[PDB]
Structure formats: structure tokens, C-alpha cells
Ligand binder design. Structure first.
Ligand code: CA
Ligand code: NI
Ligand code: NI
Ligand code: NI
Ligand code: NI
Lengths: 350, 332, 326, 336, 361, 324
């Protein structure tokens, strides 16, 4: 029977720390993993196999699951290295956020579920694995943070959430520099530029609960734009976000995709973020979100809440700094910190 | 054929700006090809006194533009066929007087065709020759306007005994006989690469440059609009030039002399639309890109998006839009 | 004489300035107002390595600039000297800190303003103590620091003078009233709960990045400037450039998204300079191995030089507008 | 015209403007992938870029190898004084094979037709890859080209056997390459050589399958014990004696990591640069080769282009050494 | 008593790992699957996942847990890089090392050995550090190393800096008791400062501190690989004054690695009960090993590094430590993968030798 | 003080941390050193990638990573060298007088940085210094012959160096050695001109076939036997690219580091040399300072080996426990 157990500041052996809250305080006997990562999991959280029975036995309410698959990719590979940069970047932080007064780790009973396996060269089978693995987290009673890998991730991700939602309704939020709405790309329905049409195909995902935010510039063929016009799906371009204000736009959009739905899929491409803050991309783009706006959007998302959050296309090998991996850490942390602060305000549990 | 607007269907080399066709640098051939812009690479850096690298800018700029579609969903505009590429001017490598002559003939030949040269350079001294070519092109009975973005005034009457190096550019350009100083705008000057004689000479001549401090204090866009109006109101031709060190260093590292405290990319995009509202420009240049210092191609990508957005916004202002009822299902 | 103001006719030191030894008599007599002191010491660093190389990279960046600032009508030539690096043994932090302390005391004794370019943040502990001793128990000191981390660990791994302890040590200095202490920019999760608890216990009125954003930044900065400079005899100003947004400060030890952008810090510099003086300037935790085309080092160099130019402009130490290229 | 053999004359003018061109192998002319245009162009080799990496099971990056390889070769003169040979005009560049993404079946078919077309012209394809699985298709194209009444030989240099009968259940990924290539019907295993295998990226089933089929690979430890060249000469002899066509393939992780850092899977304890050069001369003494490939160069891991430069010199010296063996040398009496 | 209340004496450790890492629906279960091409997925060859050294089970550095698992090799990282007189960076070595083991199988065809199951390898994690406090950090290292030895395993110690053999040999000396210990030091640098600026235990003093140990004798000590002038006179005087054999790199090149190494291993093992073998990566030529705090030319070539690891394996040691790897200085993988092969060929040759003798580890 | 020989005790920018003496012949002669390091950051003769401009600065900084004591030789380099580190037309004349002034002092100039064309001026300064009644020898290591009679219409660029240096009137061609030529940076007119003049170059292929050292020994003897002064120059692209990335024009298939160190001892057997140059270091392409570190260790090992050959060793009985 599975137990949710972690060592504060990682290290066991003769100098192991044991305080129940030591993980939210300055380390006491040693430096933890702030300099040398050791055997780090996401957030230092317990490892838990993507297994509905183990996840439920641990009582985990957030599963971190890496989907490093980067061969459903029409631009260039590299996103298979994202999850390792992310996990390593969380050793630079505590799981306590003073901006929310929340211990993220114990509030959600976060677990790290490892990586989804891949079948190189086989986009069909690799996406099938992702759906099977995501399903185990959902059936375990947890909400999910999915870390890519290329933007094919919402295809199996939203399919798994769609099946799990059953006769209820699912919303779909896609945040991206690119509209990602090719009906097919060279005949292929399930590349990383088709998250949105494949979501609209889901039997319980309706156009009025779908939306796209952040688009700009000309890596956006006309059929991708035609998709939103022809199906009446609201697009909020980056220029509109700038003109009207992020908060106004984001709040309107979260209200739309959540209206009368039972669950929400939120996919977030790192190239929605301005290239000055996010060089580690397959397709980095100017005219994007600024650093403080990324954190603002993550807080706003946390206020409304989603069932699955996915973050894709991080390519740490393209960045000589830590700015890109640490940006993705803060996307996740501020989402969770804001989510916890909201739940606690509502008298609700995760 | 419209397949270039859409995602490639199933079953289905030359390095040029926007994958556009090559047309030789010949006025007759350019007028007949149907494009509105003619891209000219000028890999010349012998007016540069700073770090080397701008010599490789034209090729890297061309390669970056191939990452994008020609279709702009923000404008409902297709840039396909709007530009052609004339190659590079041949750089002999030890005759700056002769190199500038070849540049002068190249710009005059493009201007004679009626197309808008897009001059992608090595160092900023290329603008001296391009601006003179436009001034001679319109002749002494016409009025010229001039707008440049950059962190440096480049108002050295002379530098190290030379009169046509990069830091001398504006000092030569403002001597042109049909360029009234009231039709000259310079935006973005800041920090310490601006010696006192550049400010003394600017004051002597009445150059009302908009320093970055001036821009921030005014909220940027109200002051830019006034300088746009000065450059475009009552002039017969307008020269628009970019040194992308006008941008904050964080968003344009790959330039010859990067400078903190500059424009954000979103600010430059809005300015591009403001320029395009005037519905025309005579010459476009960009100089001092330095790809060896770039990270993920950031400066090259920014320059390409600015220039292509300018073309797209000009086409939209002109009503030169595509049939938006077109669908990908029409190719089959 | 003044040719460096104009277009040219045709050791590695801060701003290509002259080297003066760390000796008070030579420093007072040299005519400068600032003394750059490199401190390539990183044995208080609990994070990723790299800041030991910051003083060299910072120096190399500053040698690219002209000395004349048209925005201020100020000439920096001759305003600073470079005293080299403090000589420190490896694997002996106690001796290294004593060497830093004696170096800063020697600069303060000369009357010049030390510009201390560090390895890790713990060198600020010793530099601030040196100023506190320099002015003595009859004077009042002020302290303002920019950074994403509070550094309010009473202890860290059982140690008391590491980088995350810096503010906990600095706020124990006896002539530093906590109401004359400012800390601006704290954000994100490298701030464990005991740092907040200790800040509350002591009355540390830190201005979080969120606090700053909510107030429009500058009104709150102005209020903390007023706390540090009003009624104090000396002011210590320190920078961890992870106070800046990661985009404009990648090359730092612990980069942080969602911070100050370059134009905002440039405004803050001018607000500080209106007080007409500062006693010590430090910058720590630059990390060149993480930099992107030297962006963080160049931002840091631009902030320090604009601060010098802005103070000179405030002091009226501008150049004659009538000078011409001659 | 022969000025390209000598120091540039300089002080030259009249070019005025340079038409936009393509980054080309050895600054050579571009010829379309068409057998007759290839046959008529006069070259002996046709460089073919294959930026395909969807057979890669390791770290990404080989997609960019054909571009970086071409750029390295543009730095060199065409005359090699060690061989008295001029490479100018001996090769052309056919660009990159046009392949869709996320569609490996179609990509491999595009590669197959491309290699068949160059072979149809009689020129020697020089195939610069992304990942190692492209060799499966290239070797099959040669096997089809010569037909079932001819005998093929195959030699590969690499640190990895790539004898996975299947990998993750798949049959045509990079680690499966030799298992597929040794299934070709006109490739007798006695005419197959594999040289340089070492270290632990060689699971036990690759060893079992090699033994089951009689693949006499020459491990790096075997080569060291033999003084290298005596064993290489015997495998050269097995690949070239009695065969109608010979396929020569390179994974430059055969080289010591110090001289090939920029490869997909770098390996310590391998061949040094001067050793590969002698092996190149030993190969060229056989006076011919049918296909040359190089895969798994990985520019994001390179150190000052060290691996890309080593590969470039190996390939150019191979052409130069073959030309010297053929007597295709330059007139010594030519002067400026 | 807090120890007793916090420990779990009756909860026994199990040596268990998943072949090719991933659990969940597509987990592989074959007993030997880890030495064969992966069957259901790609394992960690492209994406590292949650990889331990060699994919081995994690085992806390606890003598009772190690013995319960029956582990005969413990991998223990010691990333401490603040006992360092040159420059920091070796704290990042162990992470690059562990990640590089995902590029290999635990099976070595050159020896026909499954390293993982032959030795029951475990990854014991990292030794914690106390930043700025070289004394206390070294006390931690010795106590952690002691748990591995008392657990019945031989140890692979992976460093930060070369202060590592000070607590390392201290722990082995204590474990060896009334027996005798040998000490082999392979390095470009002689590392024999009596003190450095008054400090006795920096990364330039491994050899004198070893000689100070009560059961480590000069006749069982040796140094190989030295060259060039980052070698102050007192470091060379130590070997002359105490009659400790030095084999410089020029001597290894002239006489041959095999002859020199076998002679040296016979010397350091003659009449000993245990052997400490410390190996600085800058003994390797800078062309093969740029990722070091003090990289040096005129060093071992790639094939010679593997040869020396093989020869070490034929003789065997109780602790092997490998220090000063700085992966952030290397844009390639050559340095981290060189250090993997140092360990893998040592273990592969060690297992082949034990099996040849009919002995178990 | 001898304290610089040992690990620093508790308590308490130039080449080799050596003293600065002005570039003045009398001051140099009286200072007691045997070598005068001269940085020459000149890149207006370079036809390839830029970077040689920064070589003099990085070389100095690398040498500060090493002690002055060589345990392999029982030699201390401290005080044997001093540091004198500094429109193509006048600059070359400035270089000429700089070398003439050092030679006038009797010291051995160590001329660093910049592109290979500098050897033309240094060799001319040495040829003039010895006068027409003496015989000169010249040895250079490099992958490129640099035997262009002219290049792009010029006569004093880097690829012209050997064509210029071999025209000096007191340089008999049998006293000239050039070692390491390989690969395609050697146009035919450089080979033809070598044949016209009888330049007995040792290509890398020739060196490997002979086992290297027997051929090096013969070219050393041709340069040193019967000559009154010898000029030794290094382009470290003679080294295999794997061990010298930070050079202007790196080339695979060259010398290993262990082979050069042995060659250094072979040169040092002759007990003297008149000028030492190194050109075409390119630090911007370096990784962990590899090329700069190799160059530093070769030059310093040559100085150390020459001192050992001269018997100029230190008292091996000195111990760290003698410092007060
Ligand atoms: Ca108990
Ligand atoms: Ni996307
Ligand atoms: Ni995107
Ligand atoms: Ni050592
Ligand atoms: Ni060492």
C-alpha cells in the first residue's frame, strides 16, 4: 500500500532532517539541493507511479507528469529535454510561496509521476501512451500538471480528460503565439499544430467553451485562422491583450471556457511568452507576454482553476542561462499558489 | 496558386528574403517583375569602428525570414510576390570609396525602377550613400524626409580624420540639399556612446531628435506621431532606417552595439502600424545586426518581424488584402 | 585634456581608470570620488557557482564606454579609480572576510565611495559592518538593497554568515535602525517562511515586487528612499541584479522572472541620486557563465555608471556647455 | 580557368553584384536531383543532404548537421598538395531531400527515390544525414539498384553495432540499422564489415544477433590488439573482393571523443584523426565506392566545429585519395 | 533517543529497480530486460526522467539498509567543491555523470558483464554539504562513506573537488583498523601541500593527509600522471622526503601504461588489506577532458584512460574516487561520458576478474 | 624571496607575473632577465577569422595559472623574463624597432599574439641585427606554408610570410625548417615557390612516416649547425585540432601535445635560441583556454628546458620550512 513520504531537503543518511515542516524553512543540517541537485524530483515531491490505486492511496491531489515526446513536432526537436530542465530548476526554490502563504507540497500532496514512455518514430503509439498515463492520474482522484514535449500533448491530454468527463462538458483553453489549428499537416491529423481542431472533435467539448489567447506574427497559416472564424471560437490576439489589459481579457476568457462545463483543459505553449523572457523554444517569438505578465496569467488561471494544465515546447539546450527553465517553474508554482489561496478562501479542498 | 497560404497537403533551395524570387539588379527587370520591394544585401563593414559581425547580417536575415509564412492573419495580407531579392552588392574589401560607389549605383538603379529598396547592411555608414542616392534620385525640386531609430546620434562631423565612417552618418545625411531639418527625425538616443560634439552639432543644426528619455516621458506614441508627421507631411519621398540597438538589449542582443533601456518589441510593433498609416515609404534600411552575438536568433527574428510587419501593415493600409473567403479545401 | 569628451582625432580596470593601491593617502590624493574594489569571493554562495568571475567581466564591459553622458552633461573621466581585487586565501573564509573588511575600511578612511563588485551576497555583510564601524556609534546608518531574495535566514545549514543570512546579519548592526532599512523586489519561492517570520519579528519593511507593482513602483520606492536617507549620516546601497526581470538579467546566480525592467531601474537610479550622496555601493551575484551576450553585466554596468553620472548632475558637477572640439 | 589552384590574384572587379545563392557542399554547383542533369554535369559525386532525425532514439540535433557540414566545407581550397589533386568540379550539391515532418514512412520513400535517382545517374551519392536509420533506406536503394544478380559489399565505422532486431517494438529506428541492412538479399554477411564497436551502448541482444548471423565485427579492442591497420585491411578485402558495389558508411562516434565531440552519442577511446586518414588511404587503394554516407553529426554538441571539421576532412581526403589512385592528378607544370 | 524513534529497524530495504525506468501501464518486468534493447518504449535514452546512477535502486547510506539489499557497490556522490583552491564548479559533476549513464546500458559486451546485477549496484545519493565549512562538510563525507563500508559494499565516490580523499581515506583507514591500507593518487598535480595558506585539508593535500593515517605507509603509496608547472616545490619535496614513488606522465609514456600501472598496483597492494584509489580528471589530457577546474595538456589519451580503468579493475580497490569534473565548462558530452566509462570499465574489468577467479563480490 | 616556489603560507598583469621593464635596451640589459616578452596585438595582416588581436592578453592571463617552478627540470623561471607589451605601414616599422631594441640588449624576445605576418618583420629585425657576416637559421611550426609571393596583390600578408622570410640575405635555405604542412590551405604556388627556392619543408605526412622525432632531429640540426642565431616561430595549428581549437585556422591530423613537448626538449638540447614567436592564437574560439594553455605550456617548457640544459637549476635542498 502506497505512502506519501518525502525527506525535507532531500538527503537521507546520517545528516537527514526529519521536521514535519522543515521543507518550508531554511535548511538546518546542510544545504539541501540548492547547489547540487542530487536525485531531485519535481518540487522534491514523492515519486508515485502513474497508477490510479497508488495515487489514491497516497491521497495526492496534484500529479506532475512529464510527457517529453517531441517527435510529433513540425518545427524542430528539443522539447524532449524540457522536463529535466524543469525538475532541476525546482531545486532553486522552496515549495513554500510567501506571496500566497502556501506550502504547495503538503497543500496539494503533490507527487512526481515520472515520464510518459515514448516510441520513437511512432507518434500514434506515443500519444496513445500519453492518454493511458494521464488517465491513471485522473482516475486516481488528482488534477494534473503535464509538462511537454511538443504541442501534440493536448491531443491525448484532452482526449483523456474528455473520456473522464463522460456525459459532462469540457472546456478548452489554448494559450500560444500560434493558432495551432491545422485540419491536418501534410495529411497528418495529430501533429503539434492541431490541438484545437482535435479538441473541437471531442464529443463533449463545444466551440462556445473553447478559446485561444496570445497569437501574433506570421507563423500562422490562413487555415489556422479560418478554423476559429468558421467555428466561432473566440481568439484574443496578443495585440488585443495589450490594448485591453491582460486581466480583463483573461477573466473574460476563463469565464467563457468554464461556463456550464464540468472540467477544463488548459494548454500553454511557452512561445506565448516573449522571446526576451523565453529563448528556449522550438519557435520563440517576439511581441509576447512579459515576465510579470506570465506570472499574472498564472495567478489568474489559479483563481479560476483547471483540471489539467499543460506547458509545452521548452527546449533548455537552446538557453545558456536558467531564465527559461525558471520561467516554467514559476508558471506552475504561481498557478498552484493562487489555486491554493483561492481554495482556502472558499473553504474548499483540492 | 494559393497553397503557400495554408498548411501543406499530403502526398506533395535559393536563400532569398521571404523565399521571394531573384531578379537581377536592373531597373528594367525590376519594373517588369511586379514586386513593390527589392531587397538588396550590402555586406559592408568598413565604416564600423566597433565589434565586427554585421558583414554576415544579410545572410542571417534572409535565413530568418524563411521561418515564417508570407500570410499575416492580423492584416489579411499575403506578402508573397510583394518583394524580390536582388542579391548582394559585390564588396571588393579594400576601397571604401569604390564600395560606396557600387552601393550608390545599386540604390539609384533600384529607385529608377520605382520599387522600394530594402537595404540590409553591414555598418550604419551604408545609410550615407543610400540617403544620398535617394536625394539625387528625387532631384533638387523635391522634398525628402528622413527617420532613423537608433541609440546613437551618429553626428560626428569627423571621426579619426574620416568623414564617412558610421559615427559620421547623420552629420552627412543632414547636409543633403533637399532634406530640410524639419523633415528629419531621430528616435532612441541614450547612454554614453554620444560624444558632446554630436550634441553640439545637433543643436547647431536644429536636429530635434527624440531621445529615449523624451520618448518615455511622453508615453512614446504621442511624440512618435509628431515626428512621423514631420517626416511625412509635405515631403515627396521618405527614408526609413533602423539600428535595432534602439531596442532594449534584452530583446536585441545580436546587434553591433547593444544598449539597455530601449524600446520593447510591442512598442516597435505599434510604431510600425503608426508609420504604415501614412501609406508609403521610399527607402527602408536596417544596419548593424550582428548575428555572432545573437541568442536563438533574437535580434534577427525581431528585425524580420518588424520589417515584414511594416510591409503587411502598408499593404493593409493600401487595401491590398486577399480574398478572406478562400479556404484550404479549395486546393483539393 | 578634454579630448575624451569628443569624437577621436585619430591592467584591466573599471572604466579604464587608473589603478591606485588600497591606501588611504594615495586615494585621497588621486582626485577621484569613487574607488572600485573587486571581491572575487564565492565561499558564502549556496547556489550555482560562477560569481567569482564577475569582477573581471564587469570591468571588461565598462571599458567599452565613453566617459561623457549627454543625458546628464557629465564626464565620468577621473571620477573613479580601481584598487584591484582584495587579496584573499581560498578555503579560509574568516581571513577572507577580514581582508574585505580592512579593504573597505581603508577606502572609507580616504573619503572616496567604494564600489564593491562581488562574488556572493555575503560580502555585503562585511562591507556593511565596515561602514557601521567607520561612522562609529554616534552616527546613524541607512541601508537599501535591491533583490528578489530577502536573505533573512537567521542561520542556514547551521552557519551564520552565508549569502542567505546577509540581511539577518546586516539588520543586527547597532547603528542601523530598522526604520532606515529598505529592501526592494522580493518575489517568488526562494524566500522560505522563516525569512518572512524574522522580517516580521524585526519590523523589516520590505517592498515586495507585488507591493511595488500594485503601487506603480515609483511612489513606494520614493517612500523607502526617504526612510533610508532622511536623518542618516551614511547610506549603504546594494544590488543583487536578480531584482531585475530575468530577461534583462540572465547572468546572475539566481535569476528571477517577473522583476524590474531596465527603464524602471534607470528611473529609480535618478530618484536615489536626488539625495545627493551615498556612502557605499555594492553589486553582488553577477554570474557570467549564465549570461546571455553579457546582458546582465552590461545592465549592471549601465546602472552603476548612470548612478555616478546622476549624482554628479545633482551635485552640479557638469561640464561647461561652451566646450567645443578643440 | 585554374586561378582557384593558386593564391588569389585580388584587385579584381567587374562582378558588381552577387546573385543570391545556396549554401553548397565545397562551394560546388547546385544540380537538381535528376539523373540526366546529374549525368551531364560532369561531376563524379553528388552530395545529398538528409535532415531527418525521426529515427533518433538519443539526444536531438542531427537535423542541423547537413547545413553545418556544408558551411565547414566552404572554408577549404579545392587543391590538396598531399595528393596533387583538384576537387573542383568533382562534386555537385543536390540540396536536401524534401521530407514532411511526423511522417517517417513518406520521408523514407523520399530518401529512397532520391538515392535511386543519383545512382541511376552513375554518380556516387554522398549522403549526409541526420540520424543513422537513413542508412537503412540508402543501403536498400543500392541493393535494388544493382539487382539480384549482383553482389553488394558494406562497411560501416561506428561505436555502436546497431543490431537491434527491434527497439521499442519498432523495426527501422537507428539502433536497428545493421539488423535491417544485414537482411538485404544480395549482401552476403561475408562481405559486411563493422569497425570500432566499444563501450556500453551495445546491449546483449545486438551481440547475440551478430553471432547468430555471423557478423564479424571488428571491435575497437580487436583493432587495438591488431595494431589497427592489419585488421582493417582484411575487412576492406572482404568488402571489396568479388563485389559489384560497395557501401561505405560513417558514424563519427567511431572517432575518439576528443576529435568528434559534436556527434549524437560521443564515445571515448576511439580512432584518432591521423589513424582515420590512413584508413581512408587504405580504402581508396581499392579504386572505387558506390555510396558514401555520414550520419549522427550533432552540431549543438560540437566544440569549435571540431567533429564537423574532422568529418569534412575525412570525406574530402577520401575523394582526393580516390582521385590520386585513379591517376586524376593535376599537371605539375601549371603555373600562375 | 530521537534516532530510535525516527528509524525503522524492522522495515527492510529491498533491492528493486524497473528495467528502462518507466513504471505505469507500459512498465517492463523481464528479469534481464535492462541488458537488452528496450521492448515497450525508449527507456531513458532520450529523456532522462528520474534517473539514478546506472538506473540502480536508490539506497540510503545506512549500513543496515545496504546490507539488507546485499549491495556490493555503492555509488555515492560527494559534490563538495568549497575545499577548492582553484575555482568552484565540481559541485555540478555528479548530476552530469548520472544523466550521462542514461546513454548506456548496464551491460558491457567487452567483458560480458551485467554490472548492475553482478554487483547489486545502488545509488546512495549525495553527501550533504555545509557551505563555507570545509571542516564540517568533510566530517559528513567520512561518516557517509563509513555507512557504505560497514554495509559490506565497496564504494565509487564521485566528487566535487580533490579534498575528497581526505575524508575518503580517513573512512577507509578507520574501517581497515589494525590492517594496512594502500593509497594510489592519479593526477596531473602532485597534491602534496603540507598546508595551503595554513589550511591542512584543501584539495591540494590528499597525499600528506593519507600518509598521516596510522595504517597507511609510504611503501604502499604512489602517484601517477604528474606534469607541467602547477606543482609548487613543496608538493614534489613531499615525495622525495618520504620515499613515495612518483610515476610522471613522461615516464608512463616512455615505459608504457600497462607496465607502469601493473607495477604501481602491485606496490600499493603489497601486504595491504585495502586500497584507496583517488583519480583526478585532470590526469586526462585537456583534449579529452576540458570540463575540469584545472585542465591540463600532456595527459592520458582516451584509449589510455579506459586501459588504466581496466587495469585498476584487474587489481581491484576498496574505494575509487573520481574528482574535479565541471560539466558546465563543456558544451559537449565528452567529459561526462569519459567519467562514465572510467567507472564502467573499472567495474566491468573487476567483475570479469572476480568471475574468472570463481569469486563473488 | 623563494616564497613563490611553494604553497602560500598562512597569515600574510604580466607574462609569468614577471616584472615590467620599459622597452629600452640599457634598462633591459641591466635588469638581469634573459627574455623580454613583447605583445604584438596586430591583426591587419590576417585573411581569416578575427581574434588574434586578443592573443597577447589571454596568453598572459593563462600563464598566471601556473607556478614559476618546474619540478620536471628543477628550474625556476622567476626573474628570467620581463614584460614589454606594446595604418599597417608605421606599425610594422614600430615592430621592427621593438625587436631591434630587445636584440640590442642581448635578451631573447618572445613575440606573441597577432597574425603570422609579424614573423616577416621580426625575422628582418634579427637578420639586420646580426649583420651580413653571420649566418641565420629559421624554424617555424604550422599547418600552412605561407609561401605566397603575393596574395590579393599584397606582399606582406600572413600567407606571404615564408616567401618574404626566405628572401633575407643571411638565411641560407638549408638553414630553414618548416614543420607540419598538411591539408588544403596550401595552394600550388606556395609549393612551386618552395620548390623554386629549395625550401626543405617537413610535411605532417613526412613526419608521421619517419616516426616524427628522427626527422625533427635533422631539421633542428640544419637550423642550428653552423648558424650564429636561430629564429623559432609557432603557429599552433601545427597541433591536432582536438588539442588546439582556439587558433585562427584549426586543422585535424596534427601533432599531439605529448609529441610537441618532446620536440621542445629536442630543440632545447641546442642550448640557445635568438627569437621566439607565436602567432595565430584565437581566444574567442577557445574552450577552457585549451589552445592558450597548450601555447603557454610549450613556451614555458622551452624556457625551463633551456635553463636545465644550461645547468641553470635551483638548489634542490631548499624547503618550504625555510621561509620566514
Ligand atoms: Ca525505531
Ligand atoms: Ni503550439
Ligand atoms: Ni507555439
Ligand atoms: Ni588533484
Ligand atoms: Ni589535479
Amino acid at each position: 500500500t502506497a505512502k506519501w513520504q518525502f525527506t525535507p531537503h532531500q538527503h537521507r543518511g546520517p545528516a537527514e532532517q526529519f521536521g514535519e515542516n522543515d521543507h518550508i524553512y531554511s535548511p538546518k543540517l546542510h544545504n539541501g539541493s540548492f547547489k547540487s541537485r542530487g536525485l531531485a524530483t519535481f518540487m522534491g515531491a514523492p515519486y508515485c507511479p502513474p497508477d490510479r490505486h497508488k495515487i489514491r492511496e497516497m491521497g495526492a491531489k496534484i500529479c506532475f507528469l512529464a510527457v517529453p515526446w517531441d517527435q510529433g513536432q513540425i518545427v524542430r526537436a528539443g522539447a524532449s529535454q524540457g522536463a529535466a530542465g524543469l525538475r532541476d530548476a525546482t531545486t532553486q526554490y522552496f515549495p513554500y510561496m510567501f506571496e500566497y502563504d502556501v506550502d504547495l507540497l503538503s497543500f496539494f500532496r503533490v507527487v512526481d509521476c515520472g515520464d510518459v514512455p515514448t516510441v520513437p518514430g511512432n507518434n500514434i503509439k506515443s500519444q496513445e501512451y500519453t492518454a493511458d498515463y494521464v488517465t491513471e492520474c485522473l482516475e486516481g482522484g488528482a488534477k494534473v500538471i503535464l509538462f511537454g514535449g511538443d504541442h501534440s500533448l493536448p491531443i491525448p491530454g484532452a482526449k483523456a480528460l474528455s473520456r473522464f468527463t463522460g456525459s459532462g462538458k469540457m472546456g478548452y483553453l489554448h494559450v500560444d503565439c500560434h493558432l495551432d489549428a491545422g485540419p491536418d499537416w501534410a495529411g497528418n491529423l495529430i501533429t503539434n499544430c492541431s490541438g484545437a481542431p482535435r479538441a473541437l472533435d471531442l464529443p463533449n467539448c463545444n466551440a462556445r467553451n473553447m478559446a485561444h489567447m496570445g497569437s501574433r506574427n506570421s507563423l500562422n497559416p490562413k487555415d489556422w485562422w479560418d478554423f476559429y472564424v468558421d467555428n466561432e471560437i473566440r481568439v484574443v490576439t496578443m495585440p488585443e491583450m495589450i490594448e485591453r489589459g491582460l486581466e480583463v481579457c483573461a477573466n473574460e476568457i476563463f469565464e467563457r471556457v468554464k461556463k456550464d462545463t464540468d472540467s477544463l483543459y488548459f494548454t500553454w505553449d511557452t512561445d506565448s511568452i516573449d522571446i526576451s523572457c523565453m529563448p528556449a523554444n522550438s519557435a520563440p517569438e517576439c511581441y509576447g507576454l512579459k515576465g510579470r505578465e506570465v506570472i499574472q496569467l498564472a495567478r489568474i488561471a489559479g483563481r479560476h482553476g483547471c483540471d489539467i494544465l499543460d506547458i509545452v515546447e521548452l527546449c533548455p539546450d537552446f538557453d545558456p542561462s536558467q531564465i527559461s527553465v525558471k520561467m516554467t517553474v514559476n508558471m506552475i508554482y504561481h498557478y498552484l499558489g493562487s489555486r491554493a489561496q483561492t481554495l482556502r478562501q472558499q473553504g474548499k479542498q483540492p | 496558386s494559393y497553397a503557400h497560404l495554408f498548411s501543406p497537403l499530403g502526398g506533395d533551395g535559393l536563400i532569398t528574403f521571404l523565399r521571394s524570387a531573384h531578379v537581377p539588379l536592373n531597373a528594367e527587370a525590376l519594373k517588369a517583375c511586379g514586386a513593390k520591394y527589392a531587397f538588396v544585401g550590402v555586406p559592408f563593414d568598413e565604416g564600423n569602428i566597433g565589434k565586427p559581425g554585421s558583414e554576415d547580417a544579410p545572410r542571417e536575415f534572409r535565413l530568418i525570414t524563411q521561418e515564417y509564412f508570407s500570410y499575416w492573419f492580423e492584416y489579411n495580407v499575403d506578402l508573397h510576390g510583394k518583394a524580390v531579392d536582388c542579391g548582394d552588392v559585390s564588396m571588393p574589401k579594400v576601397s571604401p570609396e569604390v564600395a560606396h560607389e557600387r552601393i550608390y549605383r545599386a540604390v539609384r538603379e533600384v529607385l529608377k525602377s520605382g520599387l522600394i529598396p530594402i537595404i540590409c547592411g553591414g555598418d550604419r555608414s551604408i545609410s550615407i550613400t543610400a540617403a544620398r542616392a535617394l536625394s539625387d534620385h528625387i532631384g533638387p525640386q523635391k522634398k525628402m524626409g528622413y527617420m532613423h531609430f537608433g541609440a546613437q546620434l551618429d553626428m560626428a562631423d569627423s571621426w579619426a580624420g574620416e568623414r564617412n565612417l558610421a559615427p559620421c552618418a547623420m552629420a552627412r545625411i543632414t547636409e543633403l540639399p533637399n532634406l530640410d531639418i524639419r523633415n528629419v527625425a531621430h528616435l532612441g538616443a541614450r547612454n554614453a556612446m554620444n560624444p558632446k560634439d554630436h550634441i553640439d552639432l545637433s543643436k547647431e543644426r536644429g536636429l530635434q531628435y527624440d531621445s529615449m528619455f523624451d520618448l518615455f516621458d511622453a508615453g512614446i506614441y504621442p511624440l512618435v506621431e509628431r515626428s512621423i508627421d514631420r517626416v511625412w507631411s509635405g515631403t515627396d519621398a521618405q527614408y526609413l532606417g533602423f539600428n535595432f540597438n534602439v531596442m532594449d538589449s534584452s530583446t536585441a542582443p545580436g546587434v553591433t552595439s547593444t544598449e539597455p533601456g530601449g524600446l520593447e518589441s510591442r512598442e516597435m510593433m505599434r510604431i510600425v502600424d503608426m508609420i504604415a498609416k501614412r501609406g508609403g515609404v521610399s527607402v527602408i534600411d536596417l544596419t548593424e545586426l550582428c548575428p555572432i552575438f545573437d541568442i536563438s536568433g533574437t535580434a534577427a527574428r525581431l528585425a524580420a518581424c518588424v520589417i515584414m510587419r511594416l510591409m503587411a501593415s502598408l499593404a493593409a493600409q493600401d487595401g491590398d488584402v486577399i480574398d478572406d473567403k478562400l479556404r484550404r479545401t479549395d486546393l483539393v
